Amino acid sequence: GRQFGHLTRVRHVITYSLSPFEQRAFPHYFSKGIPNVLRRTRACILRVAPPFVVFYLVYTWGTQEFEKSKRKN
């Protein structure tokens, strides 16, 4: 919650850090971003999508129920 200097006490760690001018602007965008976004898509299909298909099915069901009620009279 405070500033730096007092937060944690960690030994045994060496971090390597590269210069920004050293490496490319876009290091292997197309060969990595597409399989990574496929993996992140497959990691959320059965968790995100089945609410929305329930939304669309209740949408069409209530809609066609309204249409059927308003097309016999």
């Binding site: 968790r47 089945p50 939304f55 209740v58």
Partner: peptide, 14 residues
């Protein structure tokens, strides 16, 4: 609880 949260998202838009 995540799936229940997404059902709540769909329920909000509903």
């Amino acid at each position: 609880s995540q799936c229940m949260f997404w059902i709540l998202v769909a329920d909000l838009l509903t």
